[PDB]
Amino acid sequence: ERLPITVSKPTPYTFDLGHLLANDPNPLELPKSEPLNASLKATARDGVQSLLNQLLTTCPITSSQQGVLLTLPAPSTILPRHKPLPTP
Amino acid sequence: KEPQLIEGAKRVLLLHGSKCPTPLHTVLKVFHSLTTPHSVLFHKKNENIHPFESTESLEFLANKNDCGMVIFGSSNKKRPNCLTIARIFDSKVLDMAELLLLPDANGEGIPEMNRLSMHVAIGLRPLMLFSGSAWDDTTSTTHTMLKSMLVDLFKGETSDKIDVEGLQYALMVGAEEPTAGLAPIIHLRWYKIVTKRSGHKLPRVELEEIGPKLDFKVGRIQEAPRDVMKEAMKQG
């Protein structure tokens, strides 16, 4: 009720929760008045806030003896294979 | 060893060239730790290996260790502190990229480490954040390749389930907004995630800086033949 859990930027974040991934397409803000690591840390904090919000909000949660588990959607970012698709 | 319909974690080979400097070795060690248990660290002082001259020996070591990815440290006058990332498809190199390690913020350097942090379990899946507009540019083949490679490198073993307790750390790969005439720069930073109560049902996120703080300048790129690439992109 007093500290914001929402981040807003001109361009919205995108997500690939299957890879636990978030994209912040907004320009990387690196002000000269501030140390690099601080700016990077701020951007990162915003992005991880967004990513965690998305994970907790949009994923199915299952609580059991196996623990508290998020169900992740299949990875949307397609990556190259190591070995060719097997002989059928 | 034989083709599988669903491949597991892409195995990673980490090795280095002649007289590779200490920061690069630290990077190789940390990367080795982050890709545990599906990585291989070769401590040989390898010489005569020059990937952009020939990927043959590279392919040999990678295939002999059944690795789909190779991280090769090297250094010379023209290209100092060079980290070469190469992917292997069908026993040959698919695509390749150079990342040249930039000097520290100014005068601390890169501390010697063998792992990311004592506050982070070895082999945990990272949260990943790609910040900057370059990652969203479909015409920048460099950033497309780098994003693909980095996700491929650090995704570990993907699964449709994850414990809420496993969400402990994040990797940010920030692409500096590019300028004409200059090679693109990227920043890699790791953070321990600390969640505080915020009043809302969603927790407030704060970060703790952890691990090495890496700044890279992109060097040479070797793209994959569209034939080979589209063959590699086919999902079963």
PDB file of C-alpha atoms in Angstrom:
ATOM      1  CA  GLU A   1       0.000   0.000   0.000  1.00  0.00           C
ATOM      2  CA  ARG A   2       3.093   2.223   0.200  1.00  0.00           C
ATOM      3  CA  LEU A   3       5.838   0.803  -2.035  1.00  0.00           C
ATOM      4  CA  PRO A   4       5.059   0.205  -5.769  1.00  0.00           C
ATOM      5  CA  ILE A   5       5.256  -3.274  -7.281  1.00  0.00           C
ATOM      6  CA  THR A   6       4.438  -1.956 -10.735  1.00  0.00           C
ATOM      7  CA  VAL A   7       6.791  -0.617 -13.379  1.00  0.00           C
ATOM      8  CA  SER A   8       5.603   1.551 -16.234  1.00  0.00           C
ATOM      9  CA  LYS A   9       7.602   2.550 -19.295  1.00  0.00           C
ATOM     10  CA  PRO A  10       6.745   3.964 -22.747  1.00  0.00           C
ATOM     11  CA  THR A  11       7.183   0.492 -24.251  1.00  0.00           C
ATOM     12  CA  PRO A  12       5.813  -2.562 -22.399  1.00  0.00           C
ATOM     13  CA  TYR A  13       7.964  -5.500 -21.280  1.00  0.00           C
ATOM     14  CA  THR A  14       7.697  -8.746 -23.223  1.00  0.00           C
ATOM     15  CA  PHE A  15       8.108 -12.241 -21.804  1.00  0.00           C
ATOM     16  CA  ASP A  16       9.320 -15.788 -22.356  1.00  0.00           C
ATOM     17  CA  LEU A  17       8.465 -17.418 -19.030  1.00  0.00           C
ATOM     18  CA  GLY A  18       9.450 -20.832 -20.369  1.00  0.00           C
ATOM     19  CA  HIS A  19      13.017 -19.543 -20.250  1.00  0.00           C
ATOM     20  CA  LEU A  20      12.283 -17.425 -17.160  1.00  0.00           C
ATOM     21  CA  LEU A  21      12.966 -14.467 -19.416  1.00  0.00           C
ATOM     22  CA  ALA A  22      11.854 -10.855 -19.750  1.00  0.00           C
ATOM     23  CA  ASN A  23      12.630  -8.244 -22.400  1.00  0.00           C
ATOM     24  CA  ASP A  24      12.892  -4.547 -21.597  1.00  0.00           C
ATOM     25  CA  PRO A  25      12.824  -3.026 -25.110  1.00  0.00           C
ATOM     26  CA  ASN A  26      13.036   0.502 -23.699  1.00  0.00           C
ATOM     27  CA  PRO A  27      16.360   2.321 -24.242  1.00  0.00           C
ATOM     28  CA  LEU A  28      19.001   1.354 -21.680  1.00  0.00           C
ATOM     29  CA  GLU A  29      19.303   4.445 -19.497  1.00  0.00           C
ATOM     30  CA  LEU A  30      22.909   5.131 -18.502  1.00  0.00           C
ATOM     31  CA  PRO A  31      23.032   8.717 -17.146  1.00  0.00           C
ATOM     32  CA  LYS A  32      26.517  10.228 -16.888  1.00  0.00           C
ATOM     33  CA  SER A  33      25.640  11.765 -13.508  1.00  0.00           C
ATOM     34  CA  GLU A  34      25.335   8.244 -12.089  1.00  0.00           C
ATOM     35  CA  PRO A  35      27.728   5.271 -11.751  1.00  0.00           C
ATOM     36  CA  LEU A  36      27.226   2.583 -14.426  1.00  0.00           C
ATOM     37  CA  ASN A  37      26.518  -0.227 -11.957  1.00  0.00           C
ATOM     38  CA  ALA A  38      23.818   1.809 -10.215  1.00  0.00           C
ATOM     39  CA  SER A  39      21.944   2.508 -13.451  1.00  0.00           C
ATOM     40  CA  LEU A  40      22.283  -1.116 -14.528  1.00  0.00           C
ATOM     41  CA  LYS A  41      21.042  -2.185 -11.091  1.00  0.00           C
ATOM     42  CA  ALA A  42      18.014   0.121 -11.356  1.00  0.00           C
ATOM     43  CA  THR A  43      17.061  -1.156 -14.811  1.00  0.00           C
ATOM     44  CA  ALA A  44      17.578  -4.715 -13.595  1.00  0.00           C
ATOM     45  CA  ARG A  45      15.414  -4.135 -10.522  1.00  0.00           C
ATOM     46  CA  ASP A  46      12.589  -2.810 -12.690  1.00  0.00           C
ATOM     47  CA  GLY A  47      12.915  -5.754 -15.070  1.00  0.00           C
ATOM     48  CA  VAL A  48      13.052  -8.432 -12.375  1.00  0.00           C
ATOM     49  CA  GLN A  49      10.085  -6.781 -10.675  1.00  0.00           C
ATOM     50  CA  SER A  50       8.179  -7.051 -13.960  1.00  0.00           C
ATOM     51  CA  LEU A  51       9.321 -10.630 -14.602  1.00  0.00           C
ATOM     52  CA  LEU A  52       8.416 -11.815 -11.097  1.00  0.00           C
ATOM     53  CA  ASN A  53       5.050 -10.052 -11.264  1.00  0.00           C
ATOM     54  CA  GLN A  54       4.344 -11.834 -14.551  1.00  0.00           C
ATOM     55  CA  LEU A  55       5.475 -15.211 -13.200  1.00  0.00           C
ATOM     56  CA  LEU A  56       3.366 -15.000 -10.044  1.00  0.00           C
ATOM     57  CA  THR A  57       0.319 -13.513 -11.782  1.00  0.00           C
ATOM     58  CA  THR A  58       0.007 -15.522 -14.993  1.00  0.00           C
ATOM     59  CA  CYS A  59       1.354 -18.966 -14.045  1.00  0.00           C
ATOM     60  CA  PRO A  60      -0.622 -21.780 -12.373  1.00  0.00           C
ATOM     61  CA  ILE A  61       0.537 -22.402  -8.796  1.00  0.00           C
ATOM     62  CA  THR A  62       0.472 -25.896  -7.287  1.00  0.00           C
ATOM     63  CA  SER A  63       1.017 -26.406  -3.557  1.00  0.00           C
ATOM     64  CA  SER A  64       1.732 -29.926  -2.296  1.00  0.00           C
ATOM     65  CA  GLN A  65       4.312 -32.133  -0.586  1.00  0.00           C
ATOM     66  CA  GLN A  66       6.449 -31.607  -3.686  1.00  0.00           C
ATOM     67  CA  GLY A  67       6.409 -27.937  -2.677  1.00  0.00           C
ATOM     68  CA  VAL A  68       5.052 -24.718  -4.152  1.00  0.00           C
ATOM     69  CA  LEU A  69       5.506 -24.891  -7.921  1.00  0.00           C
ATOM     70  CA  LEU A  70       4.846 -22.518 -10.798  1.00  0.00           C
ATOM     71  CA  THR A  71       3.726 -24.130 -14.037  1.00  0.00           C
ATOM     72  CA  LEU A  72       5.674 -22.559 -16.884  1.00  0.00           C
ATOM     73  CA  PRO A  73       4.410 -22.170 -20.449  1.00  0.00           C
ATOM     74  CA  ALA A  74       6.491 -23.856 -23.159  1.00  0.00           C
ATOM     75  CA  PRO A  75       9.543 -21.792 -24.217  1.00  0.00           C
ATOM     76  CA  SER A  76       8.574 -19.342 -26.966  1.00  0.00           C
ATOM     77  CA  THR A  77      12.114 -18.433 -28.029  1.00  0.00           C
ATOM     78  CA  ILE A  78      13.166 -21.163 -30.454  1.00  0.00           C
ATOM     79  CA  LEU A  79      16.807 -22.205 -30.153  1.00  0.00           C
ATOM     80  CA  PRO A  80      18.948 -24.347 -32.493  1.00  0.00           C
ATOM     81  CA  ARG A  81      19.417 -28.033 -31.709  1.00  0.00           C
ATOM     82  CA  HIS A  82      22.735 -29.744 -30.998  1.00  0.00           C
ATOM     83  CA  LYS A  83      22.071 -32.891 -33.005  1.00  0.00           C
ATOM     84  CA  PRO A  84      19.660 -33.304 -35.948  1.00  0.00           C
ATOM     85  CA  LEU A  85      16.117 -34.618 -35.369  1.00  0.00           C
ATOM     86  CA  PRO A  86      16.361 -38.392 -34.830  1.00  0.00           C
ATOM     87  CA  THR A  87      15.914 -41.080 -37.473  1.00  0.00           C
ATOM     88  CA  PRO A  88      12.316 -42.122 -37.474  1.00  0.00           C
TER      89      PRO A  88
ATOM     90  CA  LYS B   1      25.265 -39.621 -27.623  1.00  0.00           C
ATOM     91  CA  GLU B   2      22.624 -40.502 -30.160  1.00  0.00           C
ATOM     92  CA  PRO B   3      19.967 -38.008 -31.324  1.00  0.00           C
ATOM     93  CA  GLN B   4      17.081 -37.451 -28.921  1.00  0.00           C
ATOM     94  CA  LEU B   5      13.663 -35.966 -29.703  1.00  0.00           C
ATOM     95  CA  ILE B   6      13.916 -33.659 -26.696  1.00  0.00           C
ATOM     96  CA  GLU B   7      17.487 -32.632 -25.919  1.00  0.00           C
ATOM     97  CA  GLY B   8      18.409 -31.793 -22.339  1.00  0.00           C
ATOM     98  CA  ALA B   9      20.708 -28.996 -21.235  1.00  0.00           C
ATOM     99  CA  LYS B  10      23.070 -28.070 -24.058  1.00  0.00           C
ATOM    100  CA  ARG B  11      26.488 -29.169 -22.824  1.00  0.00           C
ATOM    101  CA  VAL B  12      29.187 -26.503 -22.682  1.00  0.00           C
ATOM    102  CA  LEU B  13      32.938 -26.775 -23.286  1.00  0.00           C
ATOM    103  CA  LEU B  14      35.129 -24.156 -21.612  1.00  0.00           C
ATOM    104  CA  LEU B  15      38.790 -23.920 -22.624  1.00  0.00           C
ATOM    105  CA  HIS B  16      41.429 -21.303 -23.451  1.00  0.00           C
ATOM    106  CA  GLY B  17      44.298 -20.186 -25.678  1.00  0.00           C
ATOM    107  CA  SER B  18      47.916 -19.158 -25.172  1.00  0.00           C
ATOM    108  CA  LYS B  19      48.771 -17.063 -22.103  1.00  0.00           C
ATOM    109  CA  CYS B  20      45.161 -16.278 -21.261  1.00  0.00           C
ATOM    110  CA  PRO B  21      44.964 -13.480 -18.613  1.00  0.00           C
ATOM    111  CA  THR B  22      43.477 -13.838 -15.117  1.00  0.00           C
ATOM    112  CA  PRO B  23      40.139 -12.023 -15.627  1.00  0.00           C
ATOM    113  CA  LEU B  24      39.318 -14.277 -18.590  1.00  0.00           C
ATOM    114  CA  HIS B  25      40.142 -17.331 -16.469  1.00  0.00           C
ATOM    115  CA  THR B  26      37.808 -16.034 -13.775  1.00  0.00           C
ATOM    116  CA  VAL B  27      35.088 -15.641 -16.407  1.00  0.00           C
ATOM    117  CA  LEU B  28      35.659 -19.198 -17.648  1.00  0.00           C
ATOM    118  CA  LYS B  29      35.518 -20.529 -14.087  1.00  0.00           C
ATOM    119  CA  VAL B  30      32.302 -18.671 -13.250  1.00  0.00           C
ATOM    120  CA  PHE B  31      30.659 -19.721 -16.520  1.00  0.00           C
ATOM    121  CA  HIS B  32      31.758 -23.280 -15.737  1.00  0.00           C
ATOM    122  CA  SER B  33      30.084 -23.022 -12.328  1.00  0.00           C
ATOM    123  CA  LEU B  34      26.866 -21.555 -13.767  1.00  0.00           C
ATOM    124  CA  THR B  35      26.484 -24.329 -16.346  1.00  0.00           C
ATOM    125  CA  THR B  36      27.083 -27.129 -13.838  1.00  0.00           C
ATOM    126  CA  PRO B  37      26.538 -30.094 -14.139  1.00  0.00           C
ATOM    127  CA  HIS B  38      26.505 -30.040 -17.949  1.00  0.00           C
ATOM    128  CA  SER B  39      29.814 -28.259 -18.555  1.00  0.00           C
ATOM    129  CA  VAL B  40      33.448 -29.226 -19.100  1.00  0.00           C
ATOM    130  CA  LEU B  41      36.449 -27.112 -18.107  1.00  0.00           C
ATOM    131  CA  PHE B  42      39.658 -27.897 -19.989  1.00  0.00           C
ATOM    132  CA  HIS B  43      42.749 -26.594 -18.154  1.00  0.00           C
ATOM    133  CA  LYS B  44      45.142 -27.201 -21.038  1.00  0.00           C
ATOM    134  CA  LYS B  45      47.096 -24.246 -22.370  1.00  0.00           C
ATOM    135  CA  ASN B  46      45.826 -24.801 -25.847  1.00  0.00           C
ATOM    136  CA  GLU B  47      47.772 -23.360 -28.720  1.00  0.00           C
ATOM    137  CA  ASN B  48      47.256 -23.358 -32.484  1.00  0.00           C
ATOM    138  CA  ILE B  49      43.512 -22.876 -31.948  1.00  0.00           C
ATOM    139  CA  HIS B  50      42.149 -19.971 -33.979  1.00  0.00           C
ATOM    140  CA  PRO B  51      38.375 -20.390 -34.536  1.00  0.00           C
ATOM    141  CA  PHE B  52      38.016 -17.729 -37.245  1.00  0.00           C
ATOM    142  CA  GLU B  53      40.897 -19.288 -39.161  1.00  0.00           C
ATOM    143  CA  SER B  54      39.524 -22.799 -38.685  1.00  0.00           C
ATOM    144  CA  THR B  55      36.958 -24.321 -36.324  1.00  0.00           C
ATOM    145  CA  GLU B  56      38.319 -27.838 -36.849  1.00  0.00           C
ATOM    146  CA  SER B  57      40.186 -28.388 -33.561  1.00  0.00           C
ATOM    147  CA  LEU B  58      37.328 -26.605 -31.808  1.00  0.00           C
ATOM    148  CA  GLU B  59      34.864 -29.045 -33.373  1.00  0.00           C
ATOM    149  CA  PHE B  60      37.141 -31.934 -32.399  1.00  0.00           C
ATOM    150  CA  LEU B  61      37.300 -31.100 -28.694  1.00  0.00           C
ATOM    151  CA  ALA B  62      33.616 -30.168 -28.563  1.00  0.00           C
ATOM    152  CA  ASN B  63      32.449 -33.362 -30.266  1.00  0.00           C
ATOM    153  CA  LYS B  64      34.861 -35.464 -28.232  1.00  0.00           C
ATOM    154  CA  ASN B  65      33.208 -34.034 -25.113  1.00  0.00           C
ATOM    155  CA  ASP B  66      29.695 -34.088 -26.626  1.00  0.00           C
ATOM    156  CA  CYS B  67      29.223 -30.340 -26.185  1.00  0.00           C
ATOM    157  CA  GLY B  68      26.834 -28.191 -28.197  1.00  0.00           C
ATOM    158  CA  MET B  69      28.477 -24.972 -27.034  1.00  0.00           C
ATOM    159  CA  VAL B  70      32.070 -23.807 -26.675  1.00  0.00           C
ATOM    160  CA  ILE B  71      33.481 -20.878 -24.707  1.00  0.00           C
ATOM    161  CA  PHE B  72      37.044 -20.164 -25.804  1.00  0.00           C
ATOM    162  CA  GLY B  73      39.277 -17.673 -24.010  1.00  0.00           C
ATOM    163  CA  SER B  74      42.230 -16.126 -25.833  1.00  0.00           C
ATOM    164  CA  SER B  75      44.291 -12.939 -25.979  1.00  0.00           C
ATOM    165  CA  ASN B  76      46.635 -11.122 -28.352  1.00  0.00           C
ATOM    166  CA  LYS B  77      47.630  -7.556 -29.249  1.00  0.00           C
ATOM    167  CA  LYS B  78      44.932  -7.121 -31.894  1.00  0.00           C
ATOM    168  CA  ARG B  79      42.177  -8.803 -29.859  1.00  0.00           C
ATOM    169  CA  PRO B  80      42.929  -8.784 -26.092  1.00  0.00           C
ATOM    170  CA  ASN B  81      40.723 -10.513 -23.492  1.00  0.00           C
ATOM    171  CA  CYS B  82      38.686 -12.244 -26.173  1.00  0.00           C
ATOM    172  CA  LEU B  83      35.862 -14.637 -25.302  1.00  0.00           C
ATOM    173  CA  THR B  84      34.685 -16.611 -28.327  1.00  0.00           C
ATOM    174  CA  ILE B  85      31.266 -18.255 -28.163  1.00  0.00           C
ATOM    175  CA  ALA B  86      30.552 -20.995 -30.693  1.00  0.00           C
ATOM    176  CA  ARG B  87      27.568 -23.299 -31.117  1.00  0.00           C
ATOM    177  CA  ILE B  88      27.907 -26.806 -32.540  1.00  0.00           C
ATOM    178  CA  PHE B  89      25.277 -28.392 -34.770  1.00  0.00           C
ATOM    179  CA  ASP B  90      25.709 -31.839 -36.330  1.00  0.00           C
ATOM    180  CA  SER B  91      29.365 -32.115 -35.248  1.00  0.00           C
ATOM    181  CA  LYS B  92      30.260 -28.796 -36.911  1.00  0.00           C
ATOM    182  CA  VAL B  93      30.211 -25.137 -35.874  1.00  0.00           C
ATOM    183  CA  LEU B  94      26.839 -23.475 -36.401  1.00  0.00           C
ATOM    184  CA  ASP B  95      27.385 -19.821 -35.516  1.00  0.00           C
ATOM    185  CA  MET B  96      30.182 -17.952 -33.752  1.00  0.00           C
ATOM    186  CA  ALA B  97      30.701 -14.614 -31.997  1.00  0.00           C
ATOM    187  CA  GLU B  98      33.542 -12.702 -30.345  1.00  0.00           C
ATOM    188  CA  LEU B  99      33.115 -10.757 -27.117  1.00  0.00           C
ATOM    189  CA  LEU B 100      36.055  -8.644 -25.966  1.00  0.00           C
ATOM    190  CA  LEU B 101      36.275  -8.053 -22.226  1.00  0.00           C
ATOM    191  CA  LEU B 102      36.462  -4.351 -21.380  1.00  0.00           C
ATOM    192  CA  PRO B 103      38.452  -2.896 -18.445  1.00  0.00           C
ATOM    193  CA  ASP B 104      36.831  -2.405 -15.025  1.00  0.00           C
ATOM    194  CA  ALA B 105      34.717   0.568 -13.841  1.00  0.00           C
ATOM    195  CA  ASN B 106      38.196   1.977 -13.116  1.00  0.00           C
ATOM    196  CA  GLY B 107      40.791   0.480 -10.766  1.00  0.00           C
ATOM    197  CA  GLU B 108      39.105  -2.383  -8.881  1.00  0.00           C
ATOM    198  CA  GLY B 109      39.458  -5.000 -11.634  1.00  0.00           C
ATOM    199  CA  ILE B 110      37.625  -8.327 -11.749  1.00  0.00           C
ATOM    200  CA  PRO B 111      37.993 -10.277  -8.469  1.00  0.00           C
ATOM    201  CA  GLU B 112      39.107 -13.904  -8.627  1.00  0.00           C
ATOM    202  CA  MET B 113      36.164 -16.282  -8.233  1.00  0.00           C
ATOM    203  CA  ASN B 114      35.297 -19.908  -8.969  1.00  0.00           C
ATOM    204  CA  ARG B 115      31.530 -19.495  -8.616  1.00  0.00           C
ATOM    205  CA  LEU B 116      28.844 -16.802  -8.753  1.00  0.00           C
ATOM    206  CA  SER B 117      28.156 -16.405  -5.023  1.00  0.00           C
ATOM    207  CA  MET B 118      27.853 -18.369  -1.780  1.00  0.00           C
ATOM    208  CA  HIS B 119      24.258 -17.120  -1.534  1.00  0.00           C
ATOM    209  CA  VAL B 120      23.303 -18.882  -4.772  1.00  0.00           C
ATOM    210  CA  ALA B 121      23.120 -22.655  -5.203  1.00  0.00           C
ATOM    211  CA  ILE B 122      25.276 -24.094  -7.975  1.00  0.00           C
ATOM    212  CA  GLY B 123      23.287 -25.021 -11.076  1.00  0.00           C
ATOM    213  CA  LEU B 124      20.106 -23.088 -10.308  1.00  0.00           C
ATOM    214  CA  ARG B 125      18.214 -21.692 -13.298  1.00  0.00           C
ATOM    215  CA  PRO B 126      18.615 -17.910 -13.601  1.00  0.00           C
ATOM    216  CA  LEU B 127      15.936 -15.351 -14.290  1.00  0.00           C
ATOM    217  CA  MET B 128      16.973 -13.562 -17.472  1.00  0.00           C
ATOM    218  CA  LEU B 129      16.533  -9.932 -18.456  1.00  0.00           C
ATOM    219  CA  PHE B 130      17.536  -8.495 -21.814  1.00  0.00           C
ATOM    220  CA  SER B 131      17.325  -4.717 -21.559  1.00  0.00           C
ATOM    221  CA  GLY B 132      17.935  -2.184 -24.314  1.00  0.00           C
ATOM    222  CA  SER B 133      16.298  -1.568 -27.685  1.00  0.00           C
ATOM    223  CA  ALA B 134      18.891  -3.511 -29.701  1.00  0.00           C
ATOM    224  CA  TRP B 135      17.460  -6.877 -28.607  1.00  0.00           C
ATOM    225  CA  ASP B 136      14.172  -5.805 -30.198  1.00  0.00           C
ATOM    226  CA  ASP B 137      15.794  -4.886 -33.523  1.00  0.00           C
ATOM    227  CA  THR B 138      15.077  -7.718 -35.968  1.00  0.00           C
ATOM    228  CA  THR B 139      17.650  -6.340 -38.414  1.00  0.00           C
ATOM    229  CA  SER B 140      20.588  -6.445 -36.008  1.00  0.00           C
ATOM    230  CA  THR B 141      21.902  -9.951 -36.682  1.00  0.00           C
ATOM    231  CA  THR B 142      24.600  -9.496 -34.046  1.00  0.00           C
ATOM    232  CA  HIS B 143      22.170  -8.948 -31.167  1.00  0.00           C
ATOM    233  CA  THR B 144      19.855 -11.674 -32.476  1.00  0.00           C
ATOM    234  CA  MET B 145      22.728 -14.159 -32.497  1.00  0.00           C
ATOM    235  CA  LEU B 146      24.046 -13.013 -29.114  1.00  0.00           C
ATOM    236  CA  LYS B 147      20.624 -13.234 -27.462  1.00  0.00           C
ATOM    237  CA  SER B 148      20.038 -16.693 -28.934  1.00  0.00           C
ATOM    238  CA  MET B 149      23.492 -17.856 -27.786  1.00  0.00           C
ATOM    239  CA  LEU B 150      23.248 -16.416 -24.272  1.00  0.00           C
ATOM    240  CA  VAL B 151      19.795 -17.863 -23.636  1.00  0.00           C
ATOM    241  CA  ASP B 152      21.049 -21.177 -25.042  1.00  0.00           C
ATOM    242  CA  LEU B 153      24.049 -20.958 -22.707  1.00  0.00           C
ATOM    243  CA  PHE B 154      22.330 -20.102 -19.433  1.00  0.00           C
ATOM    244  CA  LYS B 155      18.866 -21.688 -19.724  1.00  0.00           C
ATOM    245  CA  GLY B 156      20.248 -24.851 -18.117  1.00  0.00           C
ATOM    246  CA  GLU B 157      17.731 -27.683 -18.216  1.00  0.00           C
ATOM    247  CA  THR B 158      14.325 -26.245 -19.071  1.00  0.00           C
ATOM    248  CA  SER B 159      11.170 -27.649 -17.485  1.00  0.00           C
ATOM    249  CA  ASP B 160       7.486 -26.752 -17.191  1.00  0.00           C
ATOM    250  CA  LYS B 161       7.764 -26.547 -13.399  1.00  0.00           C
ATOM    251  CA  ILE B 162       9.764 -24.425 -10.978  1.00  0.00           C
ATOM    252  CA  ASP B 163       9.739 -24.046  -7.201  1.00  0.00           C
ATOM    253  CA  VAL B 164       9.048 -20.494  -6.009  1.00  0.00           C
ATOM    254  CA  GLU B 165      12.105 -20.970  -3.786  1.00  0.00           C
ATOM    255  CA  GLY B 166      14.231 -21.433  -6.911  1.00  0.00           C
ATOM    256  CA  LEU B 167      13.735 -17.824  -8.010  1.00  0.00           C
ATOM    257  CA  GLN B 168      16.886 -16.613  -6.274  1.00  0.00           C
ATOM    258  CA  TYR B 169      19.016 -14.771  -8.820  1.00  0.00           C
ATOM    259  CA  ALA B 170      18.866 -12.944 -12.129  1.00  0.00           C
ATOM    260  CA  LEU B 171      21.145 -12.243 -15.063  1.00  0.00           C
ATOM    261  CA  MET B 172      20.803  -8.966 -16.912  1.00  0.00           C
ATOM    262  CA  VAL B 173      22.271  -8.557 -20.368  1.00  0.00           C
ATOM    263  CA  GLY B 174      21.944  -4.875 -21.212  1.00  0.00           C
ATOM    264  CA  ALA B 175      22.715  -3.649 -24.708  1.00  0.00           C
ATOM    265  CA  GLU B 176      24.035  -0.094 -24.764  1.00  0.00           C
ATOM    266  CA  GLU B 177      22.092   2.108 -27.161  1.00  0.00           C
ATOM    267  CA  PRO B 178      24.211   1.973 -30.278  1.00  0.00           C
ATOM    268  CA  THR B 179      25.982   4.827 -32.043  1.00  0.00           C
ATOM    269  CA  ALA B 180      27.223   5.037 -35.625  1.00  0.00           C
ATOM    270  CA  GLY B 181      30.838   4.010 -36.146  1.00  0.00           C
ATOM    271  CA  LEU B 182      31.188   2.073 -32.904  1.00  0.00           C
ATOM    272  CA  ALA B 183      31.147  -1.670 -32.197  1.00  0.00           C
ATOM    273  CA  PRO B 184      28.161  -2.625 -29.989  1.00  0.00           C
ATOM    274  CA  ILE B 185      28.682  -2.938 -26.216  1.00  0.00           C
ATOM    275  CA  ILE B 186      26.853  -5.309 -23.865  1.00  0.00           C
ATOM    276  CA  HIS B 187      26.847  -5.551 -20.068  1.00  0.00           C
ATOM    277  CA  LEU B 188      26.366  -8.724 -18.040  1.00  0.00           C
ATOM    278  CA  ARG B 189      25.392  -8.376 -14.382  1.00  0.00           C
ATOM    279  CA  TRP B 190      24.177 -10.903 -11.807  1.00  0.00           C
ATOM    280  CA  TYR B 191      21.891 -10.137  -8.867  1.00  0.00           C
ATOM    281  CA  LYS B 192      20.623 -11.962  -5.801  1.00  0.00           C
ATOM    282  CA  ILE B 193      16.870 -11.425  -5.561  1.00  0.00           C
ATOM    283  CA  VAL B 194      15.512 -10.153  -2.245  1.00  0.00           C
ATOM    284  CA  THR B 195      11.745  -9.801  -1.825  1.00  0.00           C
ATOM    285  CA  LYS B 196      10.158  -7.484   0.740  1.00  0.00           C
ATOM    286  CA  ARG B 197       6.473  -7.216   1.681  1.00  0.00           C
ATOM    287  CA  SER B 198       4.888  -4.259  -0.105  1.00  0.00           C
ATOM    288  CA  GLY B 199       1.302  -4.286   1.138  1.00  0.00           C
ATOM    289  CA  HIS B 200       0.075  -5.567  -2.216  1.00  0.00           C
ATOM    290  CA  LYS B 201      -0.314  -9.279  -2.921  1.00  0.00           C
ATOM    291  CA  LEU B 202       2.816  -9.070  -5.076  1.00  0.00           C
ATOM    292  CA  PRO B 203       6.161  -8.613  -3.254  1.00  0.00           C
ATOM    293  CA  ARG B 204       8.544  -5.698  -3.838  1.00  0.00           C
ATOM    294  CA  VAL B 205      11.788  -6.656  -5.580  1.00  0.00           C
ATOM    295  CA  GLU B 206      15.233  -5.471  -4.517  1.00  0.00           C
ATOM    296  CA  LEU B 207      18.584  -6.673  -5.877  1.00  0.00           C
ATOM    297  CA  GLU B 208      22.015  -7.437  -4.438  1.00  0.00           C
ATOM    298  CA  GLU B 209      24.991  -7.221  -6.811  1.00  0.00           C
ATOM    299  CA  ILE B 210      26.744 -10.594  -7.103  1.00  0.00           C
ATOM    300  CA  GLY B 211      29.424 -12.304  -9.182  1.00  0.00           C
ATOM    301  CA  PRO B 212      31.717 -10.672 -11.757  1.00  0.00           C
ATOM    302  CA  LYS B 213      30.633  -7.481 -13.515  1.00  0.00           C
ATOM    303  CA  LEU B 214      31.269  -8.052 -17.204  1.00  0.00           C
ATOM    304  CA  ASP B 215      31.506  -5.489 -19.999  1.00  0.00           C
ATOM    305  CA  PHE B 216      31.934  -6.685 -23.585  1.00  0.00           C
ATOM    306  CA  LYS B 217      32.660  -5.195 -26.993  1.00  0.00           C
ATOM    307  CA  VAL B 218      31.378  -7.278 -29.907  1.00  0.00           C
ATOM    308  CA  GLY B 219      34.084  -8.459 -32.303  1.00  0.00           C
ATOM    309  CA  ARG B 220      33.896 -10.708 -35.348  1.00  0.00           C
ATOM    310  CA  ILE B 221      30.733 -12.599 -36.233  1.00  0.00           C
ATOM    311  CA  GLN B 222      30.457 -15.824 -38.202  1.00  0.00           C
ATOM    312  CA  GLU B 223      26.854 -16.460 -39.198  1.00  0.00           C
ATOM    313  CA  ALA B 224      25.400 -19.860 -40.030  1.00  0.00           C
ATOM    314  CA  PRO B 225      24.466 -20.903 -43.571  1.00  0.00           C
ATOM    315  CA  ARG B 226      20.688 -20.456 -43.899  1.00  0.00           C
ATOM    316  CA  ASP B 227      20.514 -24.087 -45.030  1.00  0.00           C
ATOM    317  CA  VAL B 228      22.264 -25.381 -41.918  1.00  0.00           C
ATOM    318  CA  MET B 229      20.509 -22.893 -39.645  1.00  0.00           C
ATOM    319  CA  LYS B 230      17.007 -23.767 -40.836  1.00  0.00           C
ATOM    320  CA  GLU B 231      17.934 -27.442 -40.506  1.00  0.00           C
ATOM    321  CA  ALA B 232      19.009 -26.753 -36.909  1.00  0.00           C
ATOM    322  CA  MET B 233      15.874 -24.759 -36.051  1.00  0.00           C
ATOM    323  CA  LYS B 234      13.526 -27.652 -36.797  1.00  0.00           C
ATOM    324  CA  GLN B 235      11.732 -28.760 -33.640  1.00  0.00           C
ATOM    325  CA  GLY B 236      10.416 -32.286 -33.166  1.00  0.00           C
TER     326      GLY B 236
END
